[PDB]
Design a protein around this nucleic acid. Structure first.
Ligand SMILES: [Zn+2]
Ligand SMILES: [Zn+2]
Ligand SMILES: [Zn+2]
Ligand SMILES: [Zn+2]
Lengths: 65, 65
DNA sequence: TTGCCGGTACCGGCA
DNA sequence: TTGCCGGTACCGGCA
């Protein structure tokens, strides 16, 4: 299937192929090419966007309590 | 100089040139091509990264107070 | 102080 | 339930 990272960037991951050797892209990056079949990319943008929104209110809370 | 957005993505902005008409890239995007000579791109990545770190502690605070 | 290139990081969709 | 292309969004640096 796809190495976590490649799954993250939805980029062609060539694991199975290039044997025990970590995924190619994970080369250039030189990172732990993990294989968690049950992994699903994080939607960074949207995510952090939520984060910031949340973190906001909290302050506006401190604007009171 | 450079339209805020182009400044944001550090991308060639062609304002002065293409007259009163909003910057080109700001076309594809169709956004308010503002010109705030005193603007400086936000470092999204690094930024939000700080945010998250901060927002974290706060919770670990709530893990007490 | 400030413009942009050359190169990743991300992602919306389309299989 | 997923692999990935095609197209932005971001940025580290080098002027
Ligand atoms: Zn891979
Ligand atoms: Zn890999
Ligand atoms: Zn522009
Ligand atoms: Zn513009």
């Amino acid at each position: 299937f796809a190495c976590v990272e490649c799954r993250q960037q939805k980029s062609k991951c060539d694991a199975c192929e290039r044997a025990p050797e970590p995924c190619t892209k994970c080369a250039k990056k030189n990172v732990p090419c993990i294989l968690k079949r049950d992994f699903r990319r994080t939607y960074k943008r949207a995510r952090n966007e939520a984060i910031e929104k949340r973190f906001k209110e909290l302050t506006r809370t401190l604007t009171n309590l």
